[PDB]
Enzyme design. Structure first.
Site, PDB file in Angstrom:
ATOM      1  N   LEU A  62      16.069  12.191  33.091  1.00  0.00           N
ATOM      2  CA  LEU A  62      16.141  12.917  34.393  1.00  0.00           C
ATOM      3  C   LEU A  62      16.437  14.265  33.941  1.00  0.00           C
ATOM      4  O   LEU A  62      16.240  15.359  34.746  1.00  0.00           O
ATOM      5  CB  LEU A  62      17.048  12.307  35.188  1.00  0.00           C
ATOM      6  N   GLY A  97      24.779  14.175  25.988  1.00  0.00           N
ATOM      7  CA  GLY A  97      24.650  14.890  27.177  1.00  0.00           C
ATOM      8  C   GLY A  97      23.389  14.531  27.701  1.00  0.00           C
ATOM      9  O   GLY A  97      22.538  15.431  27.739  1.00  0.00           O
ATOM     10  N   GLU A  98      22.976  13.395  28.343  1.00  0.00           N
ATOM     11  CA  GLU A  98      21.693  13.143  28.799  1.00  0.00           C
ATOM     12  C   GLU A  98      21.735  12.004  30.090  1.00  0.00           C
ATOM     13  O   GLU A  98      22.400  11.037  30.306  1.00  0.00           O
ATOM     14  CB  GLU A  98      20.630  12.482  28.000  1.00  0.00           C
ATOM     15  N   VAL A  99      20.825  12.219  31.114  1.00  0.00           N
ATOM     16  CA  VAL A  99      20.737  11.162  32.196  1.00  0.00           C
ATOM     17  C   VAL A  99      19.494  10.772  32.207  1.00  0.00           C
ATOM     18  O   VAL A  99      18.338  11.313  32.241  1.00  0.00           O
ATOM     19  CB  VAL A  99      21.093  12.189  33.603  1.00  0.00           C
ATOM     20  N   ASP A 126      32.399  22.329  40.017  1.00  0.00           N
ATOM     21  CA  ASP A 126      31.155  22.975  39.574  1.00  0.00           C
ATOM     22  C   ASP A 126      30.110  22.970  40.636  1.00  0.00           C
ATOM     23  O   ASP A 126      28.941  22.450  40.243  1.00  0.00           O
ATOM     24  CB  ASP A 126      30.772  22.623  38.130  1.00  0.00           C
TER      25      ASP A 126
HETATM   26  C1  LIG Z   1      11.977  12.944  40.392  1.00  0.00           C
HETATM   27  C2  LIG Z   1      13.718  13.112  39.940  1.00  0.00           C
HETATM   28  C3  LIG Z   1      14.573  12.485  40.309  1.00  0.00           C
HETATM   29  C4  LIG Z   1      15.730  12.740  39.759  1.00  0.00           C
HETATM   30  N1  LIG Z   1      17.077  12.769  39.771  1.00  0.00           N
HETATM   31  C5  LIG Z   1      18.206  13.067  39.335  1.00  0.00           C
HETATM   32  C6  LIG Z   1      18.318  14.221  38.514  1.00  0.00           C
HETATM   33  C7  LIG Z   1      19.758  14.510  37.992  1.00  0.00           C
HETATM   34  C8  LIG Z   1      19.808  15.938  37.133  1.00  0.00           C
HETATM   35  C9  LIG Z   1      20.021  15.640  35.661  1.00  0.00           C
HETATM   36  C10 LIG Z   1      20.286  17.209  34.921  1.00  0.00           C
HETATM   37  C11 LIG Z   1      21.425  17.835  35.631  1.00  0.00           C
HETATM   38  N2  LIG Z   1      21.144  18.025  37.228  1.00  0.00           N
HETATM   39  C12 LIG Z   1      20.939  16.713  37.574  1.00  0.00           C
HETATM   40  N3  LIG Z   1      20.790  13.887  37.926  1.00  0.00           N
HETATM   41  C13 LIG Z   1      20.643  12.751  38.910  1.00  0.00           C
HETATM   42  C14 LIG Z   1      21.496  11.748  38.932  1.00  0.00           C
HETATM   43  C15 LIG Z   1      22.965  11.867  38.698  1.00  0.00           C
HETATM   44  C16 LIG Z   1      23.931  10.919  39.114  1.00  0.00           C
HETATM   45  N4  LIG Z   1      25.127  11.276  38.642  1.00  0.00           N
HETATM   46  N5  LIG Z   1      24.821  12.211  37.686  1.00  0.00           N
HETATM   47  C17 LIG Z   1      26.026  12.791  37.115  1.00  0.00           C
HETATM   48  C18 LIG Z   1      23.740  12.541  37.813  1.00  0.00           C
HETATM   49  C19 LIG Z   1      20.789  10.745  39.788  1.00  0.00           C
HETATM   50  N6  LIG Z   1      19.657  11.140  39.975  1.00  0.00           N
HETATM   51  N7  LIG Z   1      19.442  12.216  39.350  1.00  0.00           N
HETATM   52  S1  LIG Z   1      15.324  14.128  38.504  1.00  0.00           S
HETATM   53  N8  LIG Z   1      13.715  14.177  39.047  1.00  0.00           N
END
Ligand SMILES: Cc1cc(Nc2cc([C@@H]3CCCNC3)nc3c(-c4cnn(C)c4)cnn23)sn1
Length: 251
Positions: free
Chosen positions: A11, A14-16, A110
């Site tokens: 997503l 450090g990675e989601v 933040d």
């Molecule tokens: C279509 C789609 C949906 C997305 N959804 C999506 C993007 C990101 C980005 C990752 C890079 C940093 N900014 C947030 N983080 C998250 C999290 C989540 C929940 N808790 N945490 C800590 C993150 C849940 N969904 N999600 S991205 N593209």
């Protein structure tokens, strides 16, 4: 197989990663950390609100609510922002989440569009409690002193004072987020007199961008939020009484 999850896509950073249950097909976000962590998990365990990313558990693999609408950051058109009614709705939801957090004695530290996520219905959810901390416990407030946050969104007192109250800092970052949503531009690199843009704002040169792009009503709210003295800065209960905050809007 109900407890089996497939990591289908990264997503972002450090990675989601997005994980899908092989059985139910339920989606969740997995925060992978190599390997502070204990604090994040602990804080996450206290959270239960519609505008705050939900915590499911941890195996380090943090299992969190997946937000399919992505980052608010991606809804802001450079130099344009977004329709005022959309900005207002996102702002209402952001305030609801922030009020909740402050109510339980937690400061996010933040707040910025990269951390404000959107669900399938475009409902805003506050994410990432990696920099968050307790500012109130047993009904006693603790002042903060650590440098945390992201420069363009950080309140001026962080750079000028040894100690500062938590709540006005989050209020300030919400004001910068509102500016971004309404102008598609951040007002300054940092809230320092060395930044001409910051001095210009303090001198009320609102005929300049980004202020010129913002209607008088929301601009009046920004005048109350982006106040250098945190003790004179508007509080959330008063933001909720603001004229623009309560203005009916429709695209
Ligand atoms: C279509 C789609 C949906 C997305 N959804 C999506 C993007 C990101 C980005 C990752 C890079 C940093 N900014 C947030 N983080 C998250 C999290 C989540 C929940 N808790 N945490 C800590 C993150 C849940 N969904 N999600 S991205 N593209």
């Amino acid at each position: 197989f109900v407890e089996d999850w497939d990591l289908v896509q990264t997503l972002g950073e450090g990675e989601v990663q997005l994980a899908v249950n092989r059985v139910t097909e339920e989606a969740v976000a997995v925060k992978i950390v190599d390997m502070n962590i204990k604090k994040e998990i602990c804080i996450n365990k206290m959270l239960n609100h519609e505008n705050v990313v939900k915590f499911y558990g941890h195996r380090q693999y943090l299992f969190l609510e997946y937000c399919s609408g992505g980052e608010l950051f991606d809804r802001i058109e450079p130099d344009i922002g977004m329709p005022e009614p959309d900005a207002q709705r996102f702002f209402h939801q952001l305030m609801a989440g922030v009020v909740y957090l402050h109510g339980i004695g937690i400061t996010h530290r933040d707040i910025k569009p990269e951390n404000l996520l959107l669900d399938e219905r475009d409902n805003l959810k506050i994410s990432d409690f990696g920099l968050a901390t307790v500012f109130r416990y047993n009904n006693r407030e603790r002042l903060l002193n650590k440098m945390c946050g992201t420069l363009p969104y950080v309140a001026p007192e962080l750079l000028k004072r040894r100690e500062f109250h938590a709540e006005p800092v989050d209020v300030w970052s919400c004001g910068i987020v509102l500016t971004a949503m309404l102008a598609g531009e951040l007002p300054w690199d940092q809230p320092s007199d060395s930044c001409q843009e910051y001095s210009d704002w303090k001198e009320k040169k609102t005929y300049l961008n980004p202020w010129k792009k913002i209607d008088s009503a929301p601009l009046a709210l920004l005048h109350k939020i982006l106040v250098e003295n945190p003790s004179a800065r508007i509080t959330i209960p008063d933001i909720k009484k603001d004229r623009w905050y309560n203005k009916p809007l429709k695209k």
